[PDB]
Scaffold this active site. Structure first.
Site, PDB file in Angstrom:
ATOM      1  N   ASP B 726       0.813  -1.218   0.000  1.00  0.00           N
ATOM      2  CA  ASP B 726       0.000   0.000   0.000  1.00  0.00           C
ATOM      3  C   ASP B 726       0.847   1.269   0.000  1.00  0.00           C
ATOM      4  O   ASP B 726       0.348   2.357   0.292  1.00  0.00           O
ATOM      5  CB  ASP B 726      -0.977   0.014   1.179  1.00  0.00           C
ATOM      6  N   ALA B 727       2.128   1.151  -0.323  1.00  0.00           N
ATOM      7  CA  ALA B 727       2.974   2.321  -0.480  1.00  0.00           C
ATOM      8  C   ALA B 727       2.778   2.920  -1.867  1.00  0.00           C
ATOM      9  O   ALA B 727       2.265   2.274  -2.783  1.00  0.00           O
ATOM     10  CB  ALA B 727       4.442   1.968  -0.257  1.00  0.00           C
TER      11      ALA B 727
END
Ligand SMILES: [Mg+2]
Ligand SMILES: [Zn+2]
Ligand SMILES: [Zn+2]
Ligand SMILES: [Zn+2]
Lengths: 900, 1098
Positions: B726-727
């Site tokens: 989720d970066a």
RNA sequence: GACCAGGCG
DNA sequence: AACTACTTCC
DNA sequence: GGAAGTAGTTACGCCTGGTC
């Protein structure tokens, strides 16, 4: 220096309080008009000083250095301690009124003394025996030792003892027991009688429960702060003590002057209420003492108990120095046991390093750099203990005067050991020791493979960083808590530190059938992974232009141990016949001809032979949060440094593959042909018709109840079964039609991310929504929404969403899906709270249990809990997925080692 | 028929005529118009202890917003000056007094009883009915909707409370004692009473009264309420033979023990224990008249109606016992009425006015006694005026608004208004909260109900403890304001309803309930309901009236109360909706307004009760003869932040909730007034953009005029593992060109406080001779006046307002104001002003430029949160064959687990909108279909799947797979890593425990809690636990007497160590222990416990 | 310093 | 509130 | 054995502001 060996708890005697005190407090005031403490008040300087500039009259120390000293308030009339109220009542109703004996027979006395001497180790047996003695004494009406009636004693809420006597012939009256006569009754109790009442003859006395002298806590135990408005804000203890002194002075005045007994009793009860609320404001059945604002005061009991109290808030857990917190960001290019620390934090936090023979030059350089430059220092401490902050006009002199034996608080540098913690802290892997690697930007960095132990997901997560300061602590961290260890979970004996999503998907893209790579790609990926190599292996194929091409299996095999050999079926097994053929080939001799295996190679059967991958594709089974076959074998057969090296190399390799090969997800990933759409449509149509038939049968009475449930529940269960089966069939059609070349399918079949349910809900019907296992029913009467006819039990009217996410939801289906999502989100918080409480209970119950040097597990008092831990002596972390030893694995490994 | 695109015009007209904060404004306007006078009418005239004098109360009047200068007079006051000079935007409140001297009334005197805070944009505010230019000239944003208060310079918004419907009885099963319980919350003058009847497992009927300590048999209460005859009681409770038998059995054992006259005495025994028979009677009748059914009345004449209502409640509980009716749902919105700003202000003003009345009574009596009758009757006007003391009421009201603690147990009623952006402010002004405790698992109360459709947003709710308990209103929701009940009662009685006194209820006769209380009985209740709704549509009956019936139990409910959440619907008759094309054209051309459509009976407002009788269609082509209503716009069932999300029905519900919640945290030009506004913190995105794929509701509301976010070019691929988990990977060149750039504002405040005795502080550059003097470098930017010049660069710990205070050490102390230690910036604005009391006040605003860096949180409207994992140069980013470089890269692994197909559809729509030059409609259910977008993308010259051939920037060869790329509207949240990073080597400690302080703002230390202690223990690290928990928090050394075990005393003056308890000097040794444990020993030595310590040699 | 409210994982 | 467990009157 | 009463708990941090 000494250490505390034990603590004996008792009840302070009045003489102890008088002697321990440094002042007797008489004036119910805190400070004068000028701002100095009032002599004789609660803030008298003979109890210690907290205001800067003052001096203590008992110690002579300044504020913050004087520990504090006790004072006493000689109460005019004794009061009852609220904490010992029930104990006093039990003792009163278990001892004689005139002589004080326990009212037990001498034979009973000796038998119960013998039984007290026995069974003292455990609290429960002693408590039960005490209750039995209390019952036997309470029932008795006449003291056996001296003939005297024993009027029964009634006890209301705190400090109200009320025994009932027969005032007249046939008429009884309740007589309230003042603390004076209660205390006298308690003094008449002999010392040989105390053990049967549970009291200690020396460390306690029943009379001391009725307190006639009240100790005053020191000034340092109840500080007062001056507000920025210029007014003085006192503690709750200060206010309560002031009120107690005022009421005590009023009582003393009324006693020496002479007043009617009713007024004296009222003042006595007021003083008793003040003392009781001072000791425990939330005592049962008492009006809490409220502050002038309107809030209740926090008193000694509130100071101790509670999550914000003394024990939990300042003893078990407390704020610490040399800690840092910031957002975490991913960093695949640092080792699994490393952490990226911002320059700001490294310059702020320091490590005390005593200068020695070998680090004199480095510490001199970092002292010269000073607190400004990053490789510098903040403080320098001479051997005498005097500390000097490094600053301009000090760096050169302090560097000159460094010598040997001095302490230098230097900045964090590469290689330093710290504690890294994301603190919902459930298991022991929530804190592991990482090697510091200083980074430019202001965020913590973490390798992706170490995410599963921390449960971190880079969506705003923050983690705390603690710097150990003593060499013993640093050694403890670096030896016991480093991230190289703890790869295998103590919970299930399997790998917890492994590839998560991109490592798995890139491994599949690497090792799958037909995946080939060019010379430049192979060299670049090998250099990127950190694999040391001076010559490429012979290429597998040749392009149409003559360019050499390498297989992904060869590249993966380049980073495996040369002795490793294992075979297994991963999640990519769809045709078991090929796997059975491979197993049949292997079982004949255990060393199949490599070309023969290559003839029958299959993606669903991983077969490593002498470190060469001959068949199969990299999956979640190779390395993952659970069931990583290759990683487990490497960490159990070759050590923990080899496992770390392999993990780093394989993560970097797979990342390079997935980056330079292209991995995407688009709208087309949820597309189905016309035939699949028609099949799904017929599936839902047949399911709806079946539900309609069931409803019609139930309406005519035609259906009959299933065993164990009523007609309504039978219909509900049948409908839910039909709907679930329809969803399963539609998902099966979608699985058949989507294929293995779809990237969304690829990351789901390989376990990288997502399940088959997600693909079913995204490309086919969403399925039936439910709350607490039932169909949607909350809404209007006979329906859920006002867009359906009341009394409807059909599929759509009760939450069966017939649309996919791609096809878009209708408003009714959107509301139903919202209800499902709401029930899930509500479930999460309740579950986490309940789990946290249960974990706290388990930890507080099983904290100290440990394995002794003889192999047993023993309780703190020496009680043997287990004569051999786990009944076989094997640690779950070191076990083979719960098994003592993997017998077949050892046999195959040895046979291949020797016969090979 | 009418297209949904034509119903959109009507919905837009609805939102145009009535704003988004109409509930607050309506409630407060009703409060000012009638509520204050109603409260004053409840509070009868003050009667003091004067022989022949008492004062009656006249008419309450509220003046213009004015402020009394400390040395001047009442100048006019405007909201900007009220919120800059830290004032309270209030107005004088005037009350006429009618003195009654010996039964005759003199001329009135007008006296100011206090100040009443004024809600912005209301009918009494100075901003009411002002054009955009006039509001701009007053330093105000014309987009601001008002509806909030300014108390001591801070903006306070009152959040509506989702209470249970008053005066309505609900039946349910205890499931523990097999006792059916029916409870009612009777309200009268702000006091609630929980009257409940009970049928226990023995078949006897019990009644619970809040101030009666024990339950009482029902027949006893019925006879105490004036029902002498047994047969009358049995007839009144019910006429059904089974119910008749139950009442006979319940009444035989009551009449055999307690008769009519005995019941009051029996209640008195429990209410007033003791022997005072007259006092027992008085207490029993008091708790009967006041504490049982107060809404019926407090006079003895209302006792009989209490008996009828109690009989009705008993009949309902009996019917539940027989199973003739289902359990009453508590989450059903027919049973919940909202409490708005008007009613909450009414209750608070009632409490404050009670305080003022009692104070004035005391003052009048005291002054009369302490100067006789010389001038009290010689000049009564001065006697009244000097006894007023008006500060009590205004202080009480202002304190309640500022702290939020309402009278009673209510807390958090008034909350600080959120001004992060437009969406946050409007959503806060449209928020609903539940009074239930957030800790408990209220499974039934935290779940979405079917009655929430069109009344409460189904997706916008906070995560965590408040989930489900904090709700936001749907965009179509309308909250009623009460009409006078007496006129409604009279009209209903005229319609043919006969009161229960004349005609008793029967099984074949309809029971009519007005406002939750039974009024009478009618035959053919369906005809009555039809007549009611026909009259309402004809216009002769007000909009607020709603009526429903129930064929199951033959009951007609009429509602005219306040706080009912309603939704508008198109009336459908005989398969033809009332709304036609010509109505739509008239609305479009401005000839017709929303109120007109409501008055003609074209559009109807329904709450849950009336909606129960409805059969609503969702689309115009779905209308049949059986349908009663048609949905105006199904996309309006969402909240405002939830309406920000495009294509919300292609996303999973949790992700829609995340997106709706994160829309309120984005950065943008929230208000054009930000430059001159003084606020503690604020943000400003330098280049806000319109979402290319946006709902039409967002333009209708006004979000387009205050956008918060930008359109990014997003490629969905995995890149170097830096967007893993989720970066987010972002472009350096895009950032350097202004993408996601923002500025952070902080306003420091310094007041020249005036202490007692004339000891003031001074704004000045302090000399080094003053105590507490900082470094001479920290005063570098100060001016001789004592204030920092504007536009001067200020870094951490630099002072802005040099200030010295009178000495209080035991030379002048220093109390200057400096910036927070971790905050830098440039001094944007320095203002000087005067406080309410007259002291000088200065506000300094510092702005810090926040260029995006690693760790800053970014989000999309579809709930895809993430932080910047890497900042990549443009030459390293991949590029498309069309020359398109991503501004942002997201890992594909976050797509399938979250099931956000809406984000992919939005990317396709954004690319199509950019290529076309026309923004794409992304409304909830009438937006452009994905198939149309794909076909249009195909016709524009691009691949229909949205995948494009991309090249790797690093190596230069095209990627093997076709990469999905598009335009997604990403928003930067205020969770910046610069505002969260914290590090503490060593610093201040708490005085009590000597442990490090708490908080980033005060060099706090991180809490190493007990969970981390167990983690350390499980690792076997014993010395590390010592170092972390003892050396680094509170390590100290103590002297212990080995003979006694108490703590020895060290005399620094006499250079001796000894134990005062025993006088030992040789058996004394040091021990090492945490200061918290020594403090624990002190608190244990208090409360008389002896913790004797035993020492060991190590 | 403790109270409330809002958020974050 | 909603759970448990005692306690304790019956 | 009831049948009520009574007491005891209900995850872990972190941040912001505002009022006492
Ligand atoms: Mg997270
Ligand atoms: Zn001292
Ligand atoms: Zn005796
Ligand atoms: Zn001693």
């Amino acid at each position: 220096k000494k250490v505390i060996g034990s603590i004996e708890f008792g009840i302070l005697s009045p003489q102890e309080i008088r002697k321990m005190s440094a002042v007797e407090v008489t004036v119910p005031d805190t400070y004068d008009d000028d701002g100095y403490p009032i002599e004789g008040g609660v803030m008298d300087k003979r109890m210690g000083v907290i205001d800067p500039g003052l001096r203590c009259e008992t110690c002579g120390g300044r504020a913050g250095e004087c520990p504090g000293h006790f004072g006493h308030i000689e109460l005019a009339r004794p009061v009852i301690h609220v904490g010992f109220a029930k104990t006093i009542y039990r003792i009163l109703e278990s001892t004689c009124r005139e002589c004080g004996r326990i009212k037990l027979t001498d034979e009973e006395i000796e038998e119960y003394m013998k039984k007290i001497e026995l069974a003292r180790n455990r609290r429960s047996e002693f408590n039960e025996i005490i209750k039995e003695i209390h019952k036997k004494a309470k029932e008795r009406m006449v003291c056996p030792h001296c003939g005297a009636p024993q009027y029964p004693i009634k006890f209301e809420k705190p400090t109200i003892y009320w025994e009932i006597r027969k005032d007249e012939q046939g008429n009884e009256y309740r007589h309230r027991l003042m603390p004076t006569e209660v205390r006298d009754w308690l003094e008449k109790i002999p010392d040989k009688d105390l053990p049967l009442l549970g009291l200690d003859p020396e460390k306690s006395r029943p009379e001391w429960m009725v307190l006639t002298v009240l100790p005053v806590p020191p000034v340092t135990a109840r500080p007062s702060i001056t507000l920025e408005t210029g007014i003085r804000a006192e503690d709750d203890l200060t206010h309560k003590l002031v009120d107690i002194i005022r009421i005590n002075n009023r009582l003393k005045q009324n006693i020496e002057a002479g007043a009617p007994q009713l007024i004296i009793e009222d003042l006595w009860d007021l003083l008793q209420y003040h003392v009781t609320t001072y000791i425990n404001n939330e005592a049962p059945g008492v009006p809490p003492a409220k502050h002038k604002s309107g809030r209740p005061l926090k008193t000694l009991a509130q100071r101790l108990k509670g999550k914000e109290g003394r024990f939990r808030g300042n003893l078990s857990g407390k704020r610490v120095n040399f800690s840092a917190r910031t957002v975490i960001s991913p960093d695949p290019m640092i080792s699994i046991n490393e952490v990226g620390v911002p320059v700001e934090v490294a310059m702020e936090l320091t490590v005390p390093e005593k200068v020695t023979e070998f680090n004199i030059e480095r510490l001199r350089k970092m002292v010269l750099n000073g607190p400004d430059k990053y490789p510098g220092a903040n403080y320098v401490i001479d051997p005498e203990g005097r500390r000097r902050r490094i600053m301009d006009s000090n760096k050169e002199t302090l560097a000159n005067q460094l010598d040997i034996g001095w302490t230098v608080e230097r900045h964090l540098m590469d290689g330093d050991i710290v504690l890294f913690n994301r603190q919902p802290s459930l298991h022991r892997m929530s804190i592991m020791a990482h090697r510091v690697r200083v980074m430019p930007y202001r965020t913590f960095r973490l390798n992706l493979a170490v995410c599963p132990p921390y449960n971190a997901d880079f969506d705003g997560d923050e983690m705390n960083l603690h710097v150990p300061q003593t060499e013993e602590a640093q050694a403890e961290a670096r030896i016991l808590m480093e991230v190289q260890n703890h790869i295998i979970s103590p919970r299930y004996g399997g790998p917890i530190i492994g590839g998560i999503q991109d490592h798995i998907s890139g491994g599949y893209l690497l090792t799958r059938e037909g995946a080939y790579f060019t010379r430049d790609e192979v060299e670049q990926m090998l250099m990127f992974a950190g694999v040391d190599i001076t010559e490429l292996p012979e290429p597998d194929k040749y392009d149409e232009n003559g360019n050499p091409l390498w297989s992904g299996k060869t590249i993966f095999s380049l980073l495996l141990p040369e002795d490793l050999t294992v075979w297994y079926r991963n999640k990519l097994c769809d045709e078991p016949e090929r796997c059975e053929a491979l197993e049949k080939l292997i079982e004949e001799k255990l060393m199949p001809d490599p070309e023969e295996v290559r003839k029958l190679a299959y993606d669903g059967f991983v077969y490593i032979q002498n470190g060469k991958l001959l068949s199969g594709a990299i999956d979640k089974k190779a390395y993952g949060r659970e069931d990583g076959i290759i990683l487990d074998l490497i960490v159990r057969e070759y050590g923990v440094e080899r496992a770390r090296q392999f993990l780093d190399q394989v993560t970097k390799l797979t990342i390079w593959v997935i980056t330079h090969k292209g991995f995407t997800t688009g709208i087309d990933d949820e597309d189905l042909p016309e035939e699949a759409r028609d099949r799904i449509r017929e599936i839902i149509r047949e399911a709806e018709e079946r539900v309609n038939k069931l409803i019609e049968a139930y309406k005519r009475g035609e259906l009959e109840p299933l065993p164990g449930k009523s007609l309504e529940d039978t219909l509900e269960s049948l409908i839910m079964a039909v709907l679930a089966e329809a969803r399963d069939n539609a998902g099966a059609v979608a699985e058949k039609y989507l294929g293995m070349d779809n990237h969304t399918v690829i990351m789901a079949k390989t376990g990288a991310r997502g399940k088959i349910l997600n693909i079913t809900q995204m490309a086919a019907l969403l399925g039936q929504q439910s709350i607490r296992g039932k169909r949607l029913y909350r809404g209007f009467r006979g329906r859920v929404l006002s867009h359906f006819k009341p009394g409807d039990l059909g599929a759509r009217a009760k939450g069966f969403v017939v649309n996919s996410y791609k096809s878009g939801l209708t408003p009714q289906e959107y509301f139903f899906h919202a209800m499902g999502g709401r029930e899930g989100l509500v479930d999460t918080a309740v579950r986490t709270a309940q789990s946290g409480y249960m974990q706290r209970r388990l930890i507080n119950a099983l904290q100290d249990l440990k394995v002794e040097y003889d192999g047993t597990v023993r309780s703190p008092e020496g009680i043997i809990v287990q004569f051999k831990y786990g009944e076989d002596g094997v640690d779950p972390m070191k076990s083979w997925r719960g098994k003592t030893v993997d017998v077949d694995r050892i046999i195959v490994r040895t046979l291949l080692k020797m016969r090979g | 028929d009418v297209t949904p695109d034509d119903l959109w015009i009507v919905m837009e007209s609805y939102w145009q005529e009535k704003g988004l904060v109409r509930q607050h404004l309506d409630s407060y306007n009703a409060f000012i118009e009638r509520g204050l006078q109603e409260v004053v009418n409840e509070f009868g005239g003050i009667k003091p202890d004067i022989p022949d004098f008492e004062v009656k109360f006249g008419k309450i009047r509220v003046g213009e917003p004015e402020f009394q200068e400390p040395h001047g007079q009442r100048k006019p006051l405007y909201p900007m000056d009220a919120r800059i000079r830290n004032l309270t935007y209030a107005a004088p409140l005037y009350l006429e007094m009618i003195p009654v001297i010996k039964g005759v009334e003199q001329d009135p005197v007008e006296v100011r009883i206090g100040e009443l805070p004024i809600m912005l944009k209301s009918k009494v505010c100075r901003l009411y009915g002002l054009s955009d230019e006039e509001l701009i000239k007053l330093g105000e944003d014309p987009k601001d909707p008002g509806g909030y208060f300014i108390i001591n310079g801070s903006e306070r918004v009152i959040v509506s409370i989702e209470d249970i419907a008053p005066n309505r009885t609900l039946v349910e099963k205890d499931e523990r004692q097999e006792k059916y319980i029916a409870k009612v919350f009777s309200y009268r003058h702000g006091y609630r009473a929980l009257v409940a009847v009970e049928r226990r497992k023995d078949g006897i009927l019990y009644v619970d009264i809040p101030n009666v300590p024990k339950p009482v048999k029902f027949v006893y209460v019925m006879r105490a309420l004036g029902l002498e005859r047994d047969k009358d009681i049995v007839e009144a409770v019910g006429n059904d033979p089974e119910v008749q038998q139950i009442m006979f059995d319940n009444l035989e054992d009551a009449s055999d023990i307690t008769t009519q006259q005995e019941a009051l005495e029996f209640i008195g025994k429990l209410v007033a224990p003791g022997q005072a028979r007259e006092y027992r009677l008085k207490r029993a009748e008091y708790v009967i008249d006041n504490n049982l059914l107060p809404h019926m009345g407090v006079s003895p004449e209302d006792r009989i109606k209490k008996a009828y209502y109690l009989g009705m409640m008993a009949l309902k509980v009996i019917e539940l016992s027989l199973g003739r009716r289902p359990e009453d749902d508590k989450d059903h919105y027919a049973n919940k009425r909202l409490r708005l700003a008007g009613d909450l202000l009414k209750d608070l003003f009632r409490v404050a006015f009670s305080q003022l009345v009692k104070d004035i009574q005391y003052q009048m009596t005291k002054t009369y006694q302490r100067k006789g009758d010389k001038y009290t009757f010689g000049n009564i006007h001065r006697f009244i005026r000097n006894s007023i003391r008006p500060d009590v009421l205004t202080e009480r009201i202002e304190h309640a608004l500022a702290t939020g603690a309402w009278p009673g147990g209510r807390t958090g009623v008034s909350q600080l208004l959120d001004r992060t952006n437009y969406m946050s402010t409007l959503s806060h002004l449209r928020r609903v909260t539940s009074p239930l405790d957030r800790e408990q698992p209220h499974f039934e109360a935290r779940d979405l109900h079917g009655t929430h459709w069109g009344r409460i947003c189904p997706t916008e709710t906070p995560e965590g403890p408040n989930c489900g308990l904090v709700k936001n209103l749907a965009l179509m929701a309308q909250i009623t304001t009460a009409v006078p009940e007496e006129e409604i009662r009279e009209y209903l009685m005229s319609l043919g309803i006969v009161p229960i006194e004349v005609r008793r209820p029967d099984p074949t006769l309809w029971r009519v309930y007005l406002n939750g209380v039974l009024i009478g009985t009618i035959e053919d209740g369906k005809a009555l309901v039809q007549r009611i709704r026909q009259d309402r549509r004809s216009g002769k009956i007000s909009d607020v009236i709603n009526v429903a019936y129930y064929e199951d139990v033959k009951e007609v409910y009429v509602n005219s109360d306040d706080g009912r959440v309603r939704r508008p619907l198109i009336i459908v008759e005989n398969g033809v909706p009332k709304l036609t094309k010509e109505h739509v054209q008239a609305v479009k051309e401005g000839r017709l307004k929303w109120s007109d459509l409501i008055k003609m009976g074209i559009i109807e407002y329904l709450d849950a009760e009336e909606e129960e009788n409805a059969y609503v269609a969702m689309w115009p082509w779905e209308v049949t003869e059986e349908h009663t209503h048609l949905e105006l716009m199904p996309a309006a069932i969402l909240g405002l932040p939830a309406s920000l999300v495009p294509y919300p029905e292609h996303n999973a519900a949790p992700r829609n909730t995340y997106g709706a919640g994160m829309a309120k945290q984005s950065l943008g030009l929230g208000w054009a007034n930000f430059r001159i506004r003084v606020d503690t913190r604020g943000h400003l995105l330098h280049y806000p953009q319109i979402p290319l794929v946006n709902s039409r509701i967002m333009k209708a509301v006004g979000y387009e005029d205050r956008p918060a976010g930008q359109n990014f070019v997003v490629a969905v691929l995995a890149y170097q593992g830096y967007n893993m988990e989720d970066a987010i990977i972002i472009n350096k060149a895009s950032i350097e060109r202004g993408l996601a750039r923002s500025t952070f504002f902080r306003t420091y405040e310094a007041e020249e406080k005036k202490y007692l005795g004339g000891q003031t502080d001074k704004f000045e550059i302090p000399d080094p001779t003053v105590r507490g003097y900082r470094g001479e470098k920290y005063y570098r930017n100060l001016d001789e006046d004592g204030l920092i010049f504007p536009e001067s660069k200020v870094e951490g710990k630099d002072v802005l307002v040099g200030r010295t205070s009178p000495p209080r050490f035991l030379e002048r102390r220093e109390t200057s104001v400096a910036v927070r230690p971790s905050e830098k910036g440039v001094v944007d604005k320095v203002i000087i002003t005067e406080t309410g009391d007259g002291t000088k006040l200065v506000k300094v605003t510092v702005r810090d430029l926040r260029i995006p860096e690693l760790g800053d949180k970014f989000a999309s409207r579809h709930g895809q949160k993430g932080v910047i994992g890497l900042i990549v140069p443009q030459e390293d980013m991949p590029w498309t064959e069309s020359g398109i470089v991503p501004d942002l890269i997201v890992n594909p692994h976050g797509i399938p687990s979250r099931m956000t197909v809406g984000q992919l559809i939005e990317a396709i729509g954004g690319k199509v909108a950019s290529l076309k030059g026309r923004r794409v409609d992304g409304t909830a259910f009438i937006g452009e279909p994905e198939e149309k977008l794909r076909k249009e993308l195909e016709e524009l010259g691009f691949k229909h799947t949205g995948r494009e051939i991309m090249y790797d920037g690093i190596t230069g060869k095209r990627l093997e797979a076709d990469i999905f790329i598009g335009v997604i509207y990403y928003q930067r949240l205020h969770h910046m890593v610069a505002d969260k990073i914290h590090a503490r080597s060593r610093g201040p400690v708490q005085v009590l425990t000597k442990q490090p302080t708490e908080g980033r703002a005060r060099e706090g230390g991180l809490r190493f809690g007990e969970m981390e202690r167990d983690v350390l223990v499980g690792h076997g690290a014993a010395m590390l636990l010592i170092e972390r928990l003892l050396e680094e928090s509170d390590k100290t050394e103590v002297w212990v007497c080995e003979n006694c075990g108490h703590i020895a005393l060290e005399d620094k003056r006499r250079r001796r160590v000894y134990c005062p308890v025993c006088g030992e000097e040789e058996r004394i040794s040091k021990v090492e222990m945490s200061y918290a444990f020594k403090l624990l020993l002190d608190e244990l030595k208090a409360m008389v416990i002896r913790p004797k310590l035993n020492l060991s040699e190590r």
